[PDB]
Design a protein around this nucleic acid. Structure first.
Length: 104
DNA sequence: TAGTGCCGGAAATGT
DNA sequence: CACATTTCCGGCACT
């Protein structure tokens, strides 16, 4: 079972106990790694990569640009946005998930 | 400045 | 394998 990066992020983004380092911005599917190092750290443990960091992690994200899985919110640091049909994948709309997560 | 975000090419890596 | 990162790096831009 090899989880992919974009799926790891979704996993973090739907667990309240993770809002400290990663969270939805309240605008659709846009999200922010408030503490990229902690995200990278956890991404590193899951994949067994002791030397993982936000630099390498984000190169992973950049490869999603053409795959249109995740796009970059230009100008906002550590801010990206899922551009794929997450409403169909998760079954929730951004509002519903935000409400359910207590996103502010 | 040099430090840091961010970008995308090139090659390595590993399940 | 196929390929999704992982790793490394020259570059551009901003503070």
């Amino acid at each position: 079972g090899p989880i992919q990066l974009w799926q790891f992020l979704l996993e973090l983004l739907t667990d309240k106990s993770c809002q400290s380092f990663i969270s939805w911005t309240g605008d659709g599917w846009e999200f922010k790694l408030s503490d990229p190092d902690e995200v990278a750290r956890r991404w590193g443990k899951r994949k067994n990569k002791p030397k993982m960091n936000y630099e390498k992690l984000s190169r992973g994200l950049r490869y999603y640009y053409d795959k249109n899985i995740i796009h970059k919110t230009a100008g906002k640091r550590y801010v990206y946005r899922f551009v794929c049909d997450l409403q169909s994948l998760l079954g929730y709309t951004p509002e519903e998930l935000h409400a359910m997560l207590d996103v502010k």
